[PDB]
Each structure stands twice: as C-alpha cells, then as structure tokens.
Amino acid sequence: RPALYFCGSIRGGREDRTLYERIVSRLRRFGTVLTEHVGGDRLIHEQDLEWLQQADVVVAEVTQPSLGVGYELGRAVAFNKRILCLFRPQSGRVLSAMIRGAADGSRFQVWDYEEGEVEALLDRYFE
Amino acid sequence: MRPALYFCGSIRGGREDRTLYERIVSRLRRFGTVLTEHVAAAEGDRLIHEQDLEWLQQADVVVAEVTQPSLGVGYELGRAVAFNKRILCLFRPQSGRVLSAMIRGAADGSRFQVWDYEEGEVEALLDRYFE
Ligand SMILES: O=P(O)(O)OC[C@H]1C[NH2+]C[C@@H]1O
Ligand SMILES: O=P(O)(O)OC[C@H]1C[NH2+]C[C@@H]1O
Incomplete structure (x- = not known):
C-alpha cells in the first residue's frame, strides 16, 4: 500500500476544494494520504516537502493555477517521484x-478528465 | 562573460501583469543576458518545457514575479531550487x-530571496539587488 501525497491549490484559490476532498477520499482507499488539505510559512514549506519526499506517488489536481502546486511538482520531478497530474x-x-x-x-503522467469520473480514473491508475 | 538571468512570470495562469513583466525584463537586460519565454508585445508543450528548463539550467540567477498564481512559475522555482540556483522572487x-x-x-x-514591493519601485529594487 503506497504512501500518497496530494497537491492542490490553497492560496491560489479554493475553487476546487470539494473535488480535492473527493480525490483524497478515493486515494485513502489505496494507501495512506498526506496532504496539507486536511516558523510560519517556513514550517508549512518544510512539512509539505517532508511529506512529499516520503511519498511513493505524488497526485496533483492541476486545474486551478497555483504557485505551491507547481513548486511541489518541480521538487517532485527533481526527487524522481512517480507523479500523476489531473486536469x-x-x-x-x-x-x-x-x-x-x-x-x-x-x-510523470498528465490525464485530462471530466469531474464526475475522477474516482473511476483513480481506480484505473491504482489498480 | 555576462551573468545569465532567467525570468519567470505567469502566462497560462493569466497575463494580468504582462506590462509589468516587460518593465522587469527590460531592466534585467541591463545586468546580464536574459533568457525567458516572455516576449515584449512590440516584438508543442514538451518543446516549451524542454526549452525553458534548458534556459533555467543555464542561468546564474532566476528572477520570478510571483504575484499572479501560476503552476509554471512555481514549477520553475522548484526546479531552480533543486538545480542550486540563486533565486529572487518579487511579490x-x-x-x-x-x-x-x-x-x-x-x-x-x-x-532564495522573496521581496514585497510596490509596482512603481520595481526598477529601483532590481538596481539594488544587481548592484
Ligand atoms: O497555496 P498554494 O495554492 O500556492 O499551494 C498549495 C499547495 C502547496 N502545498 C499544499 C498544496 O498542495
Ligand atoms: O503558463 P504558466 O503561467 O503556467 O507558466 C509560465 C512560466 C513557466 N514558463 C514560462 C513562465 O515563466
């Protein structure tokens, strides 16, 4: 059972917050999920990076533009993580x-999808 | 040998700040070679990723205007950190x-510096950092 890290916009905007909750709920069926979505900003940066480095797969919902999501993806590539982006x-x-x-x-996979189908897509990716 | 400077700013995240980006890029060109996808108005995706990443890897300093949220800007900053680059962010x-x-x-x-600034002061801020 993999350790999973979930990335999605926060300070970029919370438009997709309900969808992120669905994504995280489905990811918890397959493994243990770490995410911020459940000093100061330095501590958030360090904690999020710690959880990302520990993960077996990094999952990001990349529809809402976000500096933090992009930064996590760039660090994840440099850490050679397995990455799934959903758009x-x-x-x-x-x-x-x-x-x-x-x-x-x-x-590093990027999948385009329709909102209603995200659970089925995650089922297919995570076997 | 001129210092190599990579400029990051939102494009597909939104072009709200494009005129300001032109001011930043114009000032940066006083200090070194500027590599950027940004084109002054008066002038596939894997190709763009590979080209921008190569320019970033070849830069001495990465300058990012981080006011408009952008996946690409954040990604460039993440890659830049891992590439051991010197980074200046402007918010x-x-x-x-x-x-x-x-x-x-x-x-x-x-x-890795992050400076808050007021729009009319950006040239003076750049002059301070690069002099
Ligand atoms: O606040 P932002 O939108 O810039 O970035 C949020 C992402 C970065 N860390 C947690 C989450 O995945
Ligand atoms: O299109 P985006 O906003 O996601 O990212 C744009 C930045 C990434 N590459 C060029 C520019 O600095």
Whole structure:
C-alpha cells in the first residue's frame, strides 16, 4: 500500500476544494494520504516537502493555477517521484506548458478528465 | 562573460501583469543576458518545457514575479531550487493575495530571496539587488 501525497491549490484559490476532498477520499482507499488539505510559512514549506519526499506517488489536481502546486511538482520531478497530474479541460483553462510538457507518460503522467469520473480514473491508475 | 538571468512570470495562469513583466525584463537586460519565454508585445508543450528548463539550467540567477498564481512559475522555482540556483522572487501585497507558503517559506534571505514591493519601485529594487 503506497504512501500518497496530494497537491492542490490553497492560496491560489479554493475553487476546487470539494473535488480535492473527493480525490483524497478515493486515494485513502489505496494507501495512506498526506496532504496539507486536511516558523510560519517556513514550517508549512518544510512539512509539505517532508511529506512529499516520503511519498511513493505524488497526485496533483492541476486545474486551478497555483504557485505551491507547481513548486511541489518541480521538487517532485527533481526527487524522481512517480507523479500523476489531473486536469479538467471543461474549466476552459489551458494547462501550463511546464506541467503538460513535463509529462513522460510513465513516471510523470498528465490525464485530462471530466469531474464526475475522477474516482473511476483513480481506480484505473491504482489498480 | 555576462551573468545569465532567467525570468519567470505567469502566462497560462493569466497575463494580468504582462506590462509589468516587460518593465522587469527590460531592466534585467541591463545586468546580464536574459533568457525567458516572455516576449515584449512590440516584438508543442514538451518543446516549451524542454526549452525553458534548458534556459533555467543555464542561468546564474532566476528572477520570478510571483504575484499572479501560476503552476509554471512555481514549477520553475522548484526546479531552480533543486538545480542550486540563486533565486529572487518579487511579490506585490497590493494584489490583496497571501503569497503561497511554498514560496514565502522557501526563502532563506540569501540564495532564495522573496521581496514585497510596490509596482512603481520595481526598477529601483532590481538596481539594488544587481548592484
Ligand atoms: O497555496 P498554494 O495554492 O500556492 O499551494 C498549495 C499547495 C502547496 N502545498 C499544499 C498544496 O498542495
Ligand atoms: O503558463 P504558466 O503561467 O503556467 O507558466 C509560465 C512560466 C513557466 N514558463 C514560462 C513562465 O515563466
């Protein structure tokens, strides 16, 4: 059972907070989830990085633009983590080229999806 | 040999601050070679990622305007930290936003600096850091 780290916008905005709760709930079926979503900012940075380094898979919902989500993904790539990013084209946004373009299709995957189907998608990824 | 400076700022996260980014890039060009995806208005995704990452890896200093939330800007900063780069981040409290804890909290006051500023003062701030 993998250790899972979940990334999603907070100070970038909480528009997708309910969807993040669904994602985290489904991820908890497959492994232990660490996430901020359940001094000062230095402590948050250190704690989030600690949990990210411990994870077997980093899962990020990348629809809402966020510096912190991007930063976590950049650190995760440099740590050579297995990464799953989830993006909703129905938002009308174009996903950052730095995230879409970082994908290699194996270790770093980016999946476009419709909101209602996120649980099934996670089921498929996590077998 | 001119110092190599990489400039980060939101694009697909939103172009609200694009005119300000042109001012920053123009000032940075006084101090060294500027590498950036940003193009002055008067002038696939894997290709963009690889090109921007190569420029970042080749830079001495990474300068980011971090007021507009952006996945790409954050990703570049994360890669830059792991690449052992010197980093300067610029944030405007007049936006009313609370800057991401991952950026504010990554600061160490020397090789990763985060400065709050007012828009009309950005050239003077850059002159201070680079002189
Ligand atoms: O506050 P931000 O939106 O910039 O970043 C939030 C992400 C970074 N750390 C926790 C969460 O995944
Ligand atoms: O499109 P985004 O906002 O996600 O990211 C833009 C930054 C990432 N690469 C160029 C620029 O600095």
